[PDB]
Design a protein around this ligand. Structure first.
Ligand SMILES: Nc1ncnc2c1ncn2[C@@H]1O[C@H](COP(=O)(O)OP(=O)(O)O)[C@@H](O)[C@H]1O
Ligand SMILES: [Mg+2]
Lengths: 521, 50, 141, 70
């Protein structure tokens, strides 16, 4: 009736079943474990043995431990009762707010929709980020990828896309935290209590977001299936309630890394640079479910970590064919201080056709990319020689591109604690109007750093007029202010005497604490 | 001045061709070595299963 | 579409089904070659077929070679691409023109599947991304 | 300590350590930490901020200092 553990090697458990093996992808429960240990059948090994991956740690598993087949795959709660909650990979609440109310429980494994129920509709998703909505504009209903190595700004950009797109739109949101830091998953949770996206207590039904978290400490079996769990919550909102969903996945790279960590223990000889042989089809089975169908619409935004800033690597390179907008973030843009560090040339969207976004958005975007590409072909000769042989046609396209480079920078409303600047939402029309000014020489007289970290072209003129006030405001405070004051710069021990001297205890006293922890519990 | 810059920029295209030739020999050696290295990693992982 | 067939083995399809789709698309296109008409076959991402075939071979425990590809991965693409011919006049005179599509990474044509298909095919249309942002579209090197 | 780091970074970012030879900035700030007031560190450690009652009061106390060369 039930099976027993026959082999435990790392996160991969073999379970021997006397009679009627469970199906592949089905969920098994190990009873007698300290925590709830869910296994998922990866393959039939062939001697009435299945090979499984564990959704938790296998420390404490014993050969011979009873394993109960559940008869179905991993089933998670879906519905409005998950809005405002944090789920596990297996659907357990990890926010300590009680059990999750469930309209239905759904298998996290399903097939891709079909070819017949695909949606061929392109409408722009305006994000407020002017480098995005100019050069690589996002599609309302399409898959969006945020590429970039470690520390270029994938999580700040995906945080700014949350409060610029999900903070006011019609449907619901799902954040799938797949194998990233627990600290920033708590930062995202507490930011959405304060923003009112997640409401706690009796106002929980007015939430607009569900978190599904599978962060870095979880075993590779867990992180390989969180993206399927968060997608299942998004697939209920699309298939059953028929409405538009936003699905944010932080590092879809970690889904491919997690399958790669168990892959050799599942008996697979490795593929190229170290990934599993099923790398493209494991990834393709996931991304083909995140689609706009004829029932509703899932606007996916996936961060993709590129390892060692390498877009050639097979896990980022496979993701590129799955997306409708690939915002590529670069370290060289980040090292100059342009934030968001979007590579303006490498970012590609499918909404950048003239018959989709119009001609006055397409030609500005193709004009901005031409001036930035020409500058990179001159920067080979500027960094050697130094722009005194550059024709004053080439000198103007260096000054125009350097204004274009800073004008793609924008202060983010969520990066207000990194950059000391309140964030700017730029509308789509003000982005088109601004870059058409910088391209056609309408703003050639303004300084270069007047474009840096501003909203639109009206705030370049409110910053160039500000800096030309405040550089000639230097010499008021030179000849004075050293002495002769109203004595609110007072004497020495005047400022030392309001120092409330805190009592130092001059010994740690932990052995009195350690005995006190023995008497408690 | 133009005729000594011409002899100076001839001596630096040679120096940037001699350096480019040593780098391409160094790149082909690294190109051959990483193909051997990735292949030994693949056969070792296969021999551990077979 | 009144002249086009589309053979579509998408990303969620099994790796055997993406391996066989250029061959089953070629057999559909070989109908027009063999009956005197003219064909145009396009294998868009033939480099994605070879990844699907490498998946089947490592899982069938066939011995891997360079970048874990099989031994017969040159024979995979050559046996497919050599079916694009111009027939002689006593066989109808029909033809099949192939356009395999190979995606390089950082313009590396020394990659293993890329050197295989460059050997098999007659020409190449190299599209360089540096010319793509200079406004030169089609970005033909 | 963190209060002598920010005072030495104040002495370099408020322009008090140009006119100083670049070879002996290492020995210039060894004066600057030792020749300013030992009570100005206690206020910066207790406040944690360099207050408006102190950023002039320290930059006018970063003038009564003897730097090498000068
Ligand atoms: N838009 C931005 N504005 C200001 N600083 C940024 C921005 N994006 C990234 N950064 C800086 O880069 C650091 C790393 O960004 P992070 O969001 O952690 O990217 P990743 O998740 O790719 O590592 C941040 O802590 C922040 O200091
Ligand atoms: Mg991150």
């Amino acid at each position: 009736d039930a099976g027993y553990v026959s082999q435990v090697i790392g996160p991969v458990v073999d379970v021997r079943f006397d009679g009627e093996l469970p199906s592949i992808l089905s969920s098994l429960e190990v009873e007698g474990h300290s925590v709830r240990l869910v296994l998922e059948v990866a393959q039939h090994m062939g001697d009435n043995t299945v090979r499984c991956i564990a959704m938790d740690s296998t420390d404490g598993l014993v050969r011979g431990q009873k394993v109960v087949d559940t008869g179905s795959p991993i089933k998670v709660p879906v519905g409005r009762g998950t809005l405002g909650r944090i789920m596990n990979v297996i659907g357990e609440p990890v926010d300590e707010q009680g059990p999750i109310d469930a309209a239905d429980i759904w298998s996290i494994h399903r097939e891709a929709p079909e070819f017949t129920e695909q949606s061929t509709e392109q409408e722009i998703l305006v994000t407020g980020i002017k480098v995005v909505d100019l050069l690589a504009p996002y599609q309302r209903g399409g898959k969006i990828g945020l590429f970039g190595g470690a520390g270029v700004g994938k999580t700040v950009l995906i945080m700014e896309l949350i409060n610029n797109v999900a903070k006011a739109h019609g449907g619901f949101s799902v954040f799938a935290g797949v194998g990233e830091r627990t600290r920033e998953g708590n930062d995202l949770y507490r930011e959405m209590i304060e923003s009112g996206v997640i409401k706690l207590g009796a106002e929980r039904g007015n939430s607009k977001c569900t978190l599904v978290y599978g962060q870095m400490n979880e075993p590779p079996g867990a992180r390989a299936r969180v993206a399927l769990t968060g997608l299942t919550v998004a697939e209920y909102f699309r298939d059953i309630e028929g409405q538009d969903v936003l699905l944010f996945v932080d590092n879809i790279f970690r889904f491919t890394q997690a399958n790669s960590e168990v892959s050799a223990l599942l008996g697979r000889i490795p593929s190229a640079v170290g990934y599993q042989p099923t790398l493209a089809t494991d990834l393709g089975g996931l991304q083909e479910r995140i689609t706009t169908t004829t029932k509703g619409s899932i606007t996916s935004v996936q961060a993709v970590y590129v390892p060692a800033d390498d877009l050639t690597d097979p896990a980022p390179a496979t993701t590129f064919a799955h997306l409708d907008a690939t915002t590529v973030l670069s370290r060289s843009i980040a090292e100059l201080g342009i934030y968001p560090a979007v590579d303006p040339l490498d970012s590609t969207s499918r909404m950048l056709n003239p018959n989709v976004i119009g001609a006055e958005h397409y030609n500005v975007a193709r004009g901005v990319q031409k001036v930035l590409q020409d500058y990179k072909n001159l920067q080979d000769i500027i960094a050697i020689l130094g722009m005194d042989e550059l024709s004053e046609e080439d000198k103007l396209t260096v000054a125009r591109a350097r204004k274009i480079q800073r004008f793609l920078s924008q202060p983010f409303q969520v990066a207000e604690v990194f950059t000391g600047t309140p964030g700017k939402y730029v509308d789509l029309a003000d982005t088109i109007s601004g870059f058409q000014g910088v391209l056609t020489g309408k703003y050639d007289d303004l300084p270069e750093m007047a474009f840096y970290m501003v909203g639109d072209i009206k705030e370049v003129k409110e910053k160039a007029d500000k800096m030309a006030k405040d550089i000639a405001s230097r010499k008021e405070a030179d000849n004075k202010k050293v002495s002769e004051e109203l004595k609110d710069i007072p004497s020495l021990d005047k400022l030392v005497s309001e120092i409330k001297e805190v009592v130092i205890e001059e010994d740690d006293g932990l052995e009195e604490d350690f005995k006190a922890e023995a008497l408690s519990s | 001045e133009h005729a000594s810059r011409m002899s100076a920029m001839e001596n630096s295209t040679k120096s940037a061709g001699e350096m480019l030739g040593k780098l391409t020999l160094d790149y082909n050696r690294k190109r051959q070595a990483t193909i051997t290295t990735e292949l030994i990693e693949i056969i070792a992982g296969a021999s551990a299963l077979m | 579409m009144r002249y086009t067939i589309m053979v579509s083995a998408t990303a969620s399809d099994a790796a055997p089904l993406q391996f066989l789709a250029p061959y089953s698309g070629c057999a559909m296109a070989e109908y027009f070659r063999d009956t005197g008409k003219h064909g145009l076959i396009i294998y868009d991402d033939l480099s994605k077929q070879s990844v699907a075939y490498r998946q089947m071979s490592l899982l069938l425990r066939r011995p891997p070679g360079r970048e874990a590809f099989p031994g017969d991965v040159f024979y995979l693409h050559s046996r497919l691409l050599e079916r694009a011919a111009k027939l002689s006049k006593e066989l109808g005179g029909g033809s099949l023109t192939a356009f395999p599509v190979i995606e390089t990474q950082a313009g590396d044509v020394s990659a293993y599947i890329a050197t295989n298909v460059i050997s098999i095919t007659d020409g190449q249309i190299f599209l360089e991304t540096e010319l793509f942002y200079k406004g030169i579209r089609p970005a033909l090197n | 300590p963190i209060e002598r780091q920010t005072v030495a970074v104040y002495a370099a970012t408020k322009g008090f350590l140009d006119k100083v030879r670049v070879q002996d900035i290492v020995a210039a700030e060894e004066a600057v930490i030792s020749q300013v007031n030992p009570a100005v560190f206690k206020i910066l450690k207790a406040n944690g901020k360099i207050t408006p009652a102190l950023d002039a009061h320290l930059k006018a106390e970063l003038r009564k200092v003897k730097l090498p060369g000068a």
